[PDB]
């Protein structure tokens, strides 16, 4: 039944790491009374490790879009329970989204704006900094040719994200390929 917590696209076989994440997810469903009720409906569809720095790993778990709103209500508590099981790792939930390529020249086919690459990358960035809310964005175009984005986070949720700023920057570059640094505006 631990494989009923994973629905990989195309009914593909979960890898050796997804089963560990799924198996760890099943345990919290029954062991933790607080999360008993909520975790029943929730399920994931992928999971991967990303190296951050200093032999540190980050568990990036993708979630069905329809369930992206249910995880938020139990995001703060669930991450605490999964991080202890996955010692020395940070858990990040990102809803799955499709990126439809722009139509060719003179094509009648339409494309919803949410399926655009820019709209998806911005949406991934918002799901990456949960529970922190973005309050500003800056993009600096360096003379050499590279560009770096600076994201301002609400200082209210600073205790739950101050230690993850390195994981956010590393996780976002692999999913988007863009440099990002997070900062808290003075208040």
């Amino acid at each position: 039944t631990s494989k009923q917590k994973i629905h990989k696209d195309k009914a593909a076989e979960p890898s050796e790491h997804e089963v560990s994440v799924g198996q760890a997810f099943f345990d919290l469903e029954n062991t933790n009374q607080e999360l008993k009720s909520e975790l029943k409906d929730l399920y994931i569809n992928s999971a991967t490790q990303i190296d951050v720095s200093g032999n540190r790993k980050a568990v990036v778990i993708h979630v069905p879009y329809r369930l992206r709103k249910a995880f938020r209500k139990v995001h703060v508590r669930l991450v605490r329970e999964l991080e202890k099981k996955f010692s020395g790792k940070d858990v990040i939930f990102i809803a799955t989204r499709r990126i439809v390529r722009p139509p060719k020249r003179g094509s009648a086919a339409q494309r919803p704006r949410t399926r655009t690459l820019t709209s998806v990358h911005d949406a991934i960035l918002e799901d990456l900094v949960v529970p922190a809310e973005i309050v500003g964005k800056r993009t600096r175009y360096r003379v050499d040719g590279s560009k770096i984005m600076k994201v301002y986070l609400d200082p209210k949720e600073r205790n739950n994200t101050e230690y993850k700023l390195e994981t956010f920057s590393a996780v976002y570059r692999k999913l988007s390929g863009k440099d990002v640094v997070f900062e808290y505006p003075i208040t």
Binding site: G136, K137, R138, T139, R140, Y141, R142, G145
Partner: protein, 129 residues
């Protein structure tokens, strides 16, 4: 009304540069303005510029370094084939040794020297030197 956001951006920079300012704000922002700045940046005519997201159109703050003599648009955006680039440079640029005309081609926004290398024509956006 606002007709050419590129003209406002380049006119603001040119006025700021003559007054000896170090920074200048461009509003509104557009991907044409950003790509025009990148061409200037690659040739060392401006420093670092930063795009501010305001959920409407954005704003750009450009660092100036005192190397920019003039920058302006050409309106309307005339068509320029590869063979007619020479005539435009003889008209808009101080000499045959420096200064760039920015074109919008099907291969992207680029200066006239890159357009000759790729042998692609297009339309004139502006110039700077």
């Amino acid at each position: 009304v606002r007709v050419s956001v590129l003209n406002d951006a380049l006119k603001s920079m040119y006025n700021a540069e003559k007054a000896g300012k170090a920074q200048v704000e461009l509003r509104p922002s557009s991907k044409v303005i950003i790509k025009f700045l990148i061409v200037m940046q690659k040739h060392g005519y401006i420093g670092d510029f930063q795009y501010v997201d305001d959920h409407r159109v954005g704003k750009i703050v450009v660092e100036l370094n005192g190397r920019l003599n003039k920058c302006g648009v050409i309106s309307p955006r005339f068509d320029v084939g590869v063979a007619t680039i020479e005539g435009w440079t003889a008209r808009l640029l101080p000499s045959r040794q420096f200064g760039y005309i920015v074109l919008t081609t099907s291969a992207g926004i680029m200066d006239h020297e890159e357009a000759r290398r790729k042998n692609v024509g297009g339309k004139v956006l502006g110039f700077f030197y």
